[PDB]
Amino acid sequence: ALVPMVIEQTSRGERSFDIYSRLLKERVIFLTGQVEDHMANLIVAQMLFLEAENPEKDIYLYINSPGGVITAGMSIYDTMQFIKPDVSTICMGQAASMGAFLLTAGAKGKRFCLPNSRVMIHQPLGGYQGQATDIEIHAREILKVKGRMNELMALHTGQSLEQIERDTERDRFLSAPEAVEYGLVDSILTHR
Template sequence: MRKDDGYRNYLVPMVVEQTSRGERAFDIYSRLLKERIVFLGTPVDDQVANLIVAQLLHLESEDPEKDISLYINSPGGMVYAGMAIYDTMQYIKPDVSTMCVGMAMSMGAILLCGGAKGKRYALPNAKVMIHQGSAGFQGTPADIEIHAKEVLSLRRRMAEIIAHHTGQPYEQVEKDIDRDRFMDPGDAKAYGIIDDVIASRTAIESLPGSLPEGEPARLAEAEDGALPEPQA
């Protein structure tokens, strides 16, 4: 078993609903899907990407005009798999609103900033991190050179995506992803990765380009966007 496979073994809660035909049970993720909520709560790999892509395509087929909410709590993962999710988010007709709960790091941060403009959010204690991709190779020197060129190409593409969605200069993004750069929600908002920091479901009507009804509302922030200092 791979080191990161443990999360797949957790018991998935079931939700029981009363219908005209009696009781019907859904796993919690299927129940959220009915509300057009997709949850990414794992590292990103091929299997996870396939599931997320399938859910996005399904929700588009159900209603191409209604927003989809993508909740992200992920440390990142495989770049190719993450790009499959990112490209699908851009491809489908519905706006994909993104919300960071917990963490959105590496590829998770790219998915977070790749949400629809004005509809990218984070909870107050979430953490965002951007950096360049990494990889290890073995084989002949010629093979290693080929793979190294591909890693550099992926780094450039990741920097281009972040620059496009944040409005930051490409050169600045290249500099920032050279090492791990961690951001609090206020920093992520200032950088352009998210549009708002939110904490509750109240006053949602006051948000321009707000999430669908029932989604969280904006955190009342200081004018400088700073968050309160944590207390021990």
């Protein structure tokens, strides 16, 4: 169909996989589009399977996402932290708030980005409609979420918490070298 099939010869040969399954066999996972419940759950399932396959070999998460819901991103981040093997996040295309967070959450020393990739970070968005009390409850909840996100970013990038707080007040774009200097990624992939 739209996804082409490929052929691999390991034991009996002519092992037909879709391209995504063919790459998952090589411990590489793709994260594209918005981060939502079902897609993030698929990513979590793939990561768990890859851990069960070989808990020592790294896992490569190719990130290209304009963001998504904070909760699914938190699920993916917790799964990355929990599993034993190291998760190498590679940001190609672009990675927005949730995508950038999942990118910087990779294994220390293995967060890469491509020379023309774009990185953007900002405070989480949300909202609520209803009575004043529920409004206050949801506001305090989203503020706790924002604080937790800032703490995790300051932990993973090495920047001060106040630095992350003053930086993510608005949309802040970063090129690949700016991202390397900021600490979101470790190095830029150039050539083979």
